[PDB]
Amino acid sequence: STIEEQAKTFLDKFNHEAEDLFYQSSLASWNYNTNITEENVQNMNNAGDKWSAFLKEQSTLAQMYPLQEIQNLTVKLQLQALQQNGSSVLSEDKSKRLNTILNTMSTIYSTGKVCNPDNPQECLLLEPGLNEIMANSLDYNERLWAWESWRSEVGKQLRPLYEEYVVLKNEMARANHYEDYGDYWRGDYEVNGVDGYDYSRGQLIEDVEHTFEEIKPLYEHLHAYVRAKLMNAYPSYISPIGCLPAHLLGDMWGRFWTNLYSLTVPFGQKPNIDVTDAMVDQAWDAQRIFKEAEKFFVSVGLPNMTQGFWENSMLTDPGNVQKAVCHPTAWDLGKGDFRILMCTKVTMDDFLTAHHEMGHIQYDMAYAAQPFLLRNGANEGFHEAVGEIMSLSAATPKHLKSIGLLSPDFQEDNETEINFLLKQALTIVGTLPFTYMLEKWRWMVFKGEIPKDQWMKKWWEMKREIVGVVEPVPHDETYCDPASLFHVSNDYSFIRYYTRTLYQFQFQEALCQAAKHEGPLHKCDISNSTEAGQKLFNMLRLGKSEPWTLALENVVGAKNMNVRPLLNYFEPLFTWLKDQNKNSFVGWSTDWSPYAD
Amino acid sequence: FGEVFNATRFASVYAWNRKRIDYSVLYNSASFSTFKCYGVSPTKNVYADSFVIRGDEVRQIAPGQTGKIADYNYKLPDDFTGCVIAWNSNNLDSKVGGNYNYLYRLFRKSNLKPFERDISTEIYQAGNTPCNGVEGFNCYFPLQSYGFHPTNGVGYQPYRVVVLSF
Ligand SMILES: *[C@@H]1O[C@H](CO)[C@@H](O)[C@H](O)[C@H]1NC(C)=O
Ligand SMILES: *[C@@H]1O[C@H](CO)[C@@H](O)[C@H](O)[C@H]1NC(C)=O
Ligand SMILES: *[C@@H]1O[C@H](CO)[C@@H](O)[C@H](O)[C@H]1NC(C)=O
């Protein structure tokens, strides 16, 4: 009759009630996604509303159990997860205002479309629209026009809405016993009550800054190389001692540098390793791709996929017969029901994506044996890391030759290795400074270090001193550049990508060491390595019951993040870049501008 | 053994059916997922206890096993001298939208003694304040229904279990 037994009984009831209230919602959502009809939409909405009502009622019931008189860590974690009230802490009027602001911001982002004065009647949306121009066009004027137009409309529209959003979210976070909303976001990594594994919210900022400072030289060399190739592309627009313009980074926000590959390819004569033609020649289907992925996951040691996976999954595209959006997604409907929904085609990219979603489903199957609430990753950056390490293992040339997809006489020339490493760099290293900058700006904006009249100035100072990117057109206080991004204007955390990359490389190095692989880390394949599978599964079966530090120590032997694996993955490329940067200025000057130079 | 293994519908595990009744053609069916005999092999008063449980709880129908099914629904002695037969019935006992007919007791004050059947639906009194027959804080109905669906996993699919006690 003690509080411990009462909480245990309440959780016993809640685990059984939560199942089949989440399964029905999952089934309705799956039916809506696979079969797009209005009745399916209504069924999905009804199921979601019922599940949300059940969740709020259970939270209200669970708030009556104090955490002071609880001695078990699992019960305490479940009650902490359930008791969390969130936005309901505010008044009804405040909640309605916040919901209206969030919905208005999302709608303004989605419907936003800039139109040139020459023909206002016909103009481009965001997708594909300006994205195609920012990815494929080589015109300085067109790129600058698209960038400036999208900013001048979207940021001006979302500025006061973002200010009100910041105020309301700060109020909600303060009402929930937090310093600010940034503290609320950093609370996803808090560990407490465990000896030798505690992790504070204030430690996250310190760790991120330390790892970024350790990463900086490689980013500087990559930035210098990209700037040299860009000056080759753009003769009289980019200074050799200054930063890069924001509208020449290959995409809309400078988040990724992949589209710069064609401009910055080291050896254009040598082609990339693309096996699409071989896949077509061998008559490979989506079922074949998924069977090879399952075979790889069986070889590494993880079990094979259930029969229901092969009978209820939408591995192909039904066609015009029935409409279905097929963003590639792994579904855990509950009660041991796992599915994958994606229009798998005959392409190496689809091959890697199939392995990625297969790894997601394997991780879900691994932690499905835990109680309902404790059925997520230990922290928010583990699922994606697992998927990406599966993709890296599947993408290696050794695996391609072993599965019968690359000719045995293929020579792994070091030029191809450099090209692959530079592509990986443009994809991975070029986004870490952007993520760090954006999260730091949002955190100190929530904190209050940046007054409302210094948002744009501090934003562009961070662009200049951290990312090494300069704005092409002067901006004022009527602009809100961060809101132009999807995550910022849709209330989404962003440090997950940084932590995910770090965890990705740590896991890869750990499994390669377990697999007894000799040589470069980028030529590593964990195939046929049962010990790596054992370590991986031992980490995966914990769910979120144990602190993420404990799982990190289980895999890599370290309790915290580390960038040494990331620097080891790019060592050949780092040496090559240092060789090519002997006669170029490594760094940037935060004074030069395209308009003030 | 006719209606024992080929009944139209089986009973709930808490209200498990008990019937008083050549063990070769039964073993050679080659269609039973579990045919575990304790003490006496099939080749070498009889009670037939029939019910339906979840797929992953079949292992709880063995002597010396913990779990809610053994503690509160169906307990066997450690000196069991019979056989336990379990087979999947996904086609029979599952339907689109769920089959909520089968029930099981989730809460009790104490564990069932061997070969005990409990049917009373008295409101569980978890806390100190009396429930007074009304569900509320620290007051839960002890019986919960299985959510059997065709698309459930093998560990969540319905399983028909018959226990032969000699
Ligand atoms: C999709 O939904 C429509 C109407 O809800 C229905 O007629 C059709 O049979 C469904 N498709 C499938 C494959 O069940
Ligand atoms: C917490 O409860 C679980 C069962 O719910 C038990 O296995 C575990 O030993 C308990 N932990 C502590 C520290 O009492
Ligand atoms: C794994 O072992 C199988 C069976 O011996 C073999 O066919 C396959 O090529 C091996 N894979 C690797 C990457 O060595």
PDB file of N, CA, C and O in Angstrom, chain A residues 420-468:
ATOM      1  N   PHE A 420      35.372  10.166 -52.827  1.00  0.00           N
ATOM      2  CA  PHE A 420      34.374   9.724 -51.859  1.00  0.00           C
ATOM      3  C   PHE A 420      34.517  10.474 -50.542  1.00  0.00           C
ATOM      4  O   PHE A 420      33.521  10.893 -49.939  1.00  0.00           O
ATOM      5  N   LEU A 421      35.755  10.652 -50.076  1.00  0.00           N
ATOM      6  CA  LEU A 421      35.977  11.360 -48.823  1.00  0.00           C
ATOM      7  C   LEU A 421      35.548  12.815 -48.920  1.00  0.00           C
ATOM      8  O   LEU A 421      34.994  13.360 -47.962  1.00  0.00           O
ATOM      9  N   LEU A 422      35.780  13.460 -50.064  1.00  0.00           N
ATOM     10  CA  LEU A 422      35.367  14.852 -50.209  1.00  0.00           C
ATOM     11  C   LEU A 422      33.851  14.975 -50.297  1.00  0.00           C
ATOM     12  O   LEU A 422      33.274  15.936 -49.780  1.00  0.00           O
ATOM     13  N   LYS A 423      33.186  14.022 -50.957  1.00  0.00           N
ATOM     14  CA  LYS A 423      31.726  14.026 -50.963  1.00  0.00           C
ATOM     15  C   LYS A 423      31.176  13.852 -49.551  1.00  0.00           C
ATOM     16  O   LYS A 423      30.254  14.566 -49.131  1.00  0.00           O
ATOM     17  N   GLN A 424      31.750  12.912 -48.795  1.00  0.00           N
ATOM     18  CA  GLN A 424      31.340  12.717 -47.409  1.00  0.00           C
ATOM     19  C   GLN A 424      31.602  13.968 -46.583  1.00  0.00           C
ATOM     20  O   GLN A 424      30.816  14.315 -45.697  1.00  0.00           O
ATOM     21  N   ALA A 425      32.709  14.659 -46.860  1.00  0.00           N
ATOM     22  CA  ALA A 425      33.011  15.895 -46.145  1.00  0.00           C
ATOM     23  C   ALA A 425      31.970  16.963 -46.441  1.00  0.00           C
ATOM     24  O   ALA A 425      31.418  17.568 -45.520  1.00  0.00           O
ATOM     25  N   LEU A 426      31.671  17.184 -47.722  1.00  0.00           N
ATOM     26  CA  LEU A 426      30.665  18.175 -48.090  1.00  0.00           C
ATOM     27  C   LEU A 426      29.322  17.856 -47.447  1.00  0.00           C
ATOM     28  O   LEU A 426      28.585  18.763 -47.045  1.00  0.00           O
ATOM     29  N   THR A 427      28.988  16.571 -47.337  1.00  0.00           N
ATOM     30  CA  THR A 427      27.732  16.176 -46.710  1.00  0.00           C
ATOM     31  C   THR A 427      27.743  16.363 -45.192  1.00  0.00           C
ATOM     32  O   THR A 427      26.748  16.821 -44.619  1.00  0.00           O
ATOM     33  N   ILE A 428      28.857  16.048 -44.531  1.00  0.00           N
ATOM     34  CA  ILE A 428      28.854  15.887 -43.079  1.00  0.00           C
ATOM     35  C   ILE A 428      29.524  17.071 -42.388  1.00  0.00           C
ATOM     36  O   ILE A 428      28.937  17.709 -41.506  1.00  0.00           O
ATOM     37  N   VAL A 429      30.771  17.367 -42.757  1.00  0.00           N
ATOM     38  CA  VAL A 429      31.529  18.414 -42.082  1.00  0.00           C
ATOM     39  C   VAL A 429      30.964  19.801 -42.363  1.00  0.00           C
ATOM     40  O   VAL A 429      31.028  20.677 -41.492  1.00  0.00           O
ATOM     41  N   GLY A 430      30.392  20.021 -43.549  1.00  0.00           N
ATOM     42  CA  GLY A 430      29.893  21.337 -43.901  1.00  0.00           C
ATOM     43  C   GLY A 430      28.624  21.752 -43.190  1.00  0.00           C
ATOM     44  O   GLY A 430      28.240  22.922 -43.275  1.00  0.00           O
ATOM     45  N   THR A 431      27.963  20.828 -42.491  1.00  0.00           N
ATOM     46  CA  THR A 431      26.734  21.152 -41.779  1.00  0.00           C
ATOM     47  C   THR A 431      26.924  21.313 -40.278  1.00  0.00           C
ATOM     48  O   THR A 431      26.056  21.903 -39.625  1.00  0.00           O
ATOM     49  N   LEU A 432      28.020  20.803 -39.715  1.00  0.00           N
ATOM     50  CA  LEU A 432      28.237  20.925 -38.274  1.00  0.00           C
ATOM     51  C   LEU A 432      28.379  22.372 -37.814  1.00  0.00           C
ATOM     52  O   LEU A 432      27.738  22.739 -36.812  1.00  0.00           O
ATOM     53  N   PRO A 433      29.191  23.229 -38.452  1.00  0.00           N
ATOM     54  CA  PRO A 433      29.219  24.637 -38.019  1.00  0.00           C
ATOM     55  C   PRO A 433      27.869  25.320 -38.119  1.00  0.00           C
ATOM     56  O   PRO A 433      27.524  26.123 -37.247  1.00  0.00           O
ATOM     57  N   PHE A 434      27.090  25.014 -39.158  1.00  0.00           N
ATOM     58  CA  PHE A 434      25.766  25.608 -39.308  1.00  0.00           C
ATOM     59  C   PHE A 434      24.852  25.193 -38.160  1.00  0.00           C
ATOM     60  O   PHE A 434      24.142  26.021 -37.579  1.00  0.00           O
ATOM     61  N   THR A 435      24.866  23.902 -37.817  1.00  0.00           N
ATOM     62  CA  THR A 435      24.046  23.407 -36.718  1.00  0.00           C
ATOM     63  C   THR A 435      24.449  24.050 -35.397  1.00  0.00           C
ATOM     64  O   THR A 435      23.595  24.501 -34.621  1.00  0.00           O
ATOM     65  N   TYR A 436      25.756  24.102 -35.127  1.00  0.00           N
ATOM     66  CA  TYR A 436      26.243  24.705 -33.891  1.00  0.00           C
ATOM     67  C   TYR A 436      25.851  26.174 -33.806  1.00  0.00           C
ATOM     68  O   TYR A 436      25.374  26.648 -32.769  1.00  0.00           O
ATOM     69  N   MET A 437      26.034  26.906 -34.907  1.00  0.00           N
ATOM     70  CA  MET A 437      25.675  28.318 -34.945  1.00  0.00           C
ATOM     71  C   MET A 437      24.191  28.523 -34.684  1.00  0.00           C
ATOM     72  O   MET A 437      23.807  29.379 -33.878  1.00  0.00           O
ATOM     73  N   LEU A 438      23.340  27.751 -35.364  1.00  0.00           N
ATOM     74  CA  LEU A 438      21.900  27.937 -35.233  1.00  0.00           C
ATOM     75  C   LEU A 438      21.438  27.622 -33.816  1.00  0.00           C
ATOM     76  O   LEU A 438      20.643  28.363 -33.225  1.00  0.00           O
ATOM     77  N   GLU A 439      21.940  26.522 -33.247  1.00  0.00           N
ATOM     78  CA  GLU A 439      21.532  26.160 -31.894  1.00  0.00           C
ATOM     79  C   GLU A 439      22.034  27.171 -30.873  1.00  0.00           C
ATOM     80  O   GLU A 439      21.313  27.513 -29.932  1.00  0.00           O
ATOM     81  N   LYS A 440      23.263  27.668 -31.040  1.00  0.00           N
ATOM     82  CA  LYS A 440      23.785  28.664 -30.111  1.00  0.00           C
ATOM     83  C   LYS A 440      22.972  29.951 -30.177  1.00  0.00           C
ATOM     84  O   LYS A 440      22.630  30.544 -29.142  1.00  0.00           O
ATOM     85  N   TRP A 441      22.641  30.392 -31.393  1.00  0.00           N
ATOM     86  CA  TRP A 441      21.838  31.597 -31.553  1.00  0.00           C
ATOM     87  C   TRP A 441      20.471  31.432 -30.905  1.00  0.00           C
ATOM     88  O   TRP A 441      20.019  32.308 -30.160  1.00  0.00           O
ATOM     89  N   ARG A 442      19.803  30.305 -31.162  1.00  0.00           N
ATOM     90  CA  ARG A 442      18.486  30.090 -30.571  1.00  0.00           C
ATOM     91  C   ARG A 442      18.567  30.004 -29.051  1.00  0.00           C
ATOM     92  O   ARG A 442      17.707  30.545 -28.345  1.00  0.00           O
ATOM     93  N   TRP A 443      19.599  29.336 -28.530  1.00  0.00           N
ATOM     94  CA  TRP A 443      19.736  29.185 -27.087  1.00  0.00           C
ATOM     95  C   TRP A 443      19.912  30.533 -26.404  1.00  0.00           C
ATOM     96  O   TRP A 443      19.269  30.811 -25.387  1.00  0.00           O
ATOM     97  N   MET A 444      20.779  31.393 -26.949  1.00  0.00           N
ATOM     98  CA  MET A 444      21.001  32.666 -26.267  1.00  0.00           C
ATOM     99  C   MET A 444      19.889  33.666 -26.565  1.00  0.00           C
ATOM    100  O   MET A 444      19.705  34.631 -25.814  1.00  0.00           O
ATOM    101  N   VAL A 445      19.139  33.466 -27.651  1.00  0.00           N
ATOM    102  CA  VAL A 445      17.939  34.270 -27.871  1.00  0.00           C
ATOM    103  C   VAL A 445      16.881  33.928 -26.830  1.00  0.00           C
ATOM    104  O   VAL A 445      16.235  34.813 -26.256  1.00  0.00           O
ATOM    105  N   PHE A 446      16.691  32.633 -26.569  1.00  0.00           N
ATOM    106  CA  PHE A 446      15.762  32.213 -25.525  1.00  0.00           C
ATOM    107  C   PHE A 446      16.232  32.690 -24.156  1.00  0.00           C
ATOM    108  O   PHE A 446      15.427  33.121 -23.321  1.00  0.00           O
ATOM    109  N   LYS A 447      17.539  32.617 -23.908  1.00  0.00           N
ATOM    110  CA  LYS A 447      18.116  33.068 -22.648  1.00  0.00           C
ATOM    111  C   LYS A 447      17.882  34.558 -22.435  1.00  0.00           C
ATOM    112  O   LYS A 447      17.548  34.988 -21.327  1.00  0.00           O
ATOM    113  N   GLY A 448      18.056  35.352 -23.488  1.00  0.00           N
ATOM    114  CA  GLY A 448      17.892  36.792 -23.428  1.00  0.00           C
ATOM    115  C   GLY A 448      19.161  37.577 -23.680  1.00  0.00           C
ATOM    116  O   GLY A 448      19.138  38.813 -23.592  1.00  0.00           O
ATOM    117  N   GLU A 449      20.271  36.905 -23.986  1.00  0.00           N
ATOM    118  CA  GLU A 449      21.541  37.577 -24.232  1.00  0.00           C
ATOM    119  C   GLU A 449      21.465  38.474 -25.461  1.00  0.00           C
ATOM    120  O   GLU A 449      22.200  39.461 -25.562  1.00  0.00           O
ATOM    121  N   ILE A 450      20.586  38.139 -26.400  1.00  0.00           N
ATOM    122  CA  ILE A 450      20.401  38.945 -27.604  1.00  0.00           C
ATOM    123  C   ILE A 450      19.086  39.707 -27.499  1.00  0.00           C
ATOM    124  O   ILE A 450      18.010  39.092 -27.531  1.00  0.00           O
ATOM    125  N   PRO A 451      19.121  41.032 -27.366  1.00  0.00           N
ATOM    126  CA  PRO A 451      17.873  41.802 -27.350  1.00  0.00           C
ATOM    127  C   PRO A 451      17.176  41.746 -28.700  1.00  0.00           C
ATOM    128  O   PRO A 451      17.776  41.407 -29.721  1.00  0.00           O
ATOM    129  N   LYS A 452      15.884  42.090 -28.691  1.00  0.00           N
ATOM    130  CA  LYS A 452      15.072  41.997 -29.901  1.00  0.00           C
ATOM    131  C   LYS A 452      15.621  42.854 -31.033  1.00  0.00           C
ATOM    132  O   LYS A 452      15.379  42.559 -32.209  1.00  0.00           O
ATOM    133  N   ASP A 453      16.358  43.916 -30.705  1.00  0.00           N
ATOM    134  CA  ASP A 453      16.914  44.800 -31.721  1.00  0.00           C
ATOM    135  C   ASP A 453      18.311  44.396 -32.180  1.00  0.00           C
ATOM    136  O   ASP A 453      18.906  45.114 -32.991  1.00  0.00           O
ATOM    137  N   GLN A 454      18.852  43.285 -31.680  1.00  0.00           N
ATOM    138  CA  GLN A 454      20.149  42.787 -32.120  1.00  0.00           C
ATOM    139  C   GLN A 454      20.095  41.379 -32.695  1.00  0.00           C
ATOM    140  O   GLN A 454      21.143  40.734 -32.803  1.00  0.00           O
ATOM    141  N   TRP A 455      18.913  40.881 -33.058  1.00  0.00           N
ATOM    142  CA  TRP A 455      18.784  39.524 -33.577  1.00  0.00           C
ATOM    143  C   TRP A 455      19.542  39.343 -34.886  1.00  0.00           C
ATOM    144  O   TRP A 455      20.366  38.431 -35.009  1.00  0.00           O
ATOM    145  N   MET A 456      19.286  40.216 -35.863  1.00  0.00           N
ATOM    146  CA  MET A 456      19.914  40.058 -37.172  1.00  0.00           C
ATOM    147  C   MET A 456      21.405  40.357 -37.113  1.00  0.00           C
ATOM    148  O   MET A 456      22.211  39.671 -37.756  1.00  0.00           O
ATOM    149  N   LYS A 457      21.793  41.383 -36.352  1.00  0.00           N
ATOM    150  CA  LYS A 457      23.201  41.741 -36.242  1.00  0.00           C
ATOM    151  C   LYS A 457      24.006  40.591 -35.650  1.00  0.00           C
ATOM    152  O   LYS A 457      25.036  40.188 -36.198  1.00  0.00           O
ATOM    153  N   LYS A 458      23.526  40.034 -34.535  1.00  0.00           N
ATOM    154  CA  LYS A 458      24.219  38.908 -33.919  1.00  0.00           C
ATOM    155  C   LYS A 458      24.170  37.668 -34.799  1.00  0.00           C
ATOM    156  O   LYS A 458      25.144  36.911 -34.849  1.00  0.00           O
ATOM    157  N   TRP A 459      23.055  37.443 -35.496  1.00  0.00           N
ATOM    158  CA  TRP A 459      22.956  36.314 -36.415  1.00  0.00           C
ATOM    159  C   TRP A 459      24.043  36.382 -37.481  1.00  0.00           C
ATOM    160  O   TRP A 459      24.747  35.399 -37.745  1.00  0.00           O
ATOM    161  N   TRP A 460      24.215  37.557 -38.086  1.00  0.00           N
ATOM    162  CA  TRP A 460      25.199  37.675 -39.155  1.00  0.00           C
ATOM    163  C   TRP A 460      26.622  37.702 -38.609  1.00  0.00           C
ATOM    164  O   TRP A 460      27.549  37.239 -39.284  1.00  0.00           O
ATOM    165  N   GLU A 461      26.818  38.204 -37.388  1.00  0.00           N
ATOM    166  CA  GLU A 461      28.128  38.078 -36.755  1.00  0.00           C
ATOM    167  C   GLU A 461      28.486  36.615 -36.527  1.00  0.00           C
ATOM    168  O   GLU A 461      29.625  36.200 -36.761  1.00  0.00           O
ATOM    169  N   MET A 462      27.520  35.811 -36.077  1.00  0.00           N
ATOM    170  CA  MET A 462      27.767  34.377 -35.938  1.00  0.00           C
ATOM    171  C   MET A 462      28.067  33.737 -37.286  1.00  0.00           C
ATOM    172  O   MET A 462      28.941  32.869 -37.386  1.00  0.00           O
ATOM    173  N   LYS A 463      27.342  34.142 -38.329  1.00  0.00           N
ATOM    174  CA  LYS A 463      27.656  33.654 -39.669  1.00  0.00           C
ATOM    175  C   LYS A 463      29.093  33.974 -40.057  1.00  0.00           C
ATOM    176  O   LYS A 463      29.783  33.127 -40.636  1.00  0.00           O
ATOM    177  N   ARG A 464      29.562  35.181 -39.748  1.00  0.00           N
ATOM    178  CA  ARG A 464      30.899  35.602 -40.144  1.00  0.00           C
ATOM    179  C   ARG A 464      32.017  34.976 -39.318  1.00  0.00           C
ATOM    180  O   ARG A 464      33.042  34.593 -39.892  1.00  0.00           O
ATOM    181  N   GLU A 465      31.859  34.856 -37.998  1.00  0.00           N
ATOM    182  CA  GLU A 465      32.947  34.380 -37.152  1.00  0.00           C
ATOM    183  C   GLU A 465      32.934  32.875 -36.908  1.00  0.00           C
ATOM    184  O   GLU A 465      33.943  32.339 -36.438  1.00  0.00           O
ATOM    185  N   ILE A 466      31.839  32.180 -37.211  1.00  0.00           N
ATOM    186  CA  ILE A 466      31.754  30.752 -36.923  1.00  0.00           C
ATOM    187  C   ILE A 466      31.658  29.957 -38.217  1.00  0.00           C
ATOM    188  O   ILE A 466      32.461  29.052 -38.464  1.00  0.00           O
ATOM    189  N   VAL A 467      30.671  30.290 -39.051  1.00  0.00           N
ATOM    190  CA  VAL A 467      30.443  29.552 -40.291  1.00  0.00           C
ATOM    191  C   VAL A 467      31.339  30.039 -41.422  1.00  0.00           C
ATOM    192  O   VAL A 467      31.598  29.280 -42.369  1.00  0.00           O
ATOM    193  N   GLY A 468      31.857  31.259 -41.336  1.00  0.00           N
ATOM    194  CA  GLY A 468      32.646  31.815 -42.425  1.00  0.00           C
ATOM    195  C   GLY A 468      31.829  32.110 -43.662  1.00  0.00           C
ATOM    196  O   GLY A 468      32.296  31.879 -44.784  1.00  0.00           O
TER     197      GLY A 468
END
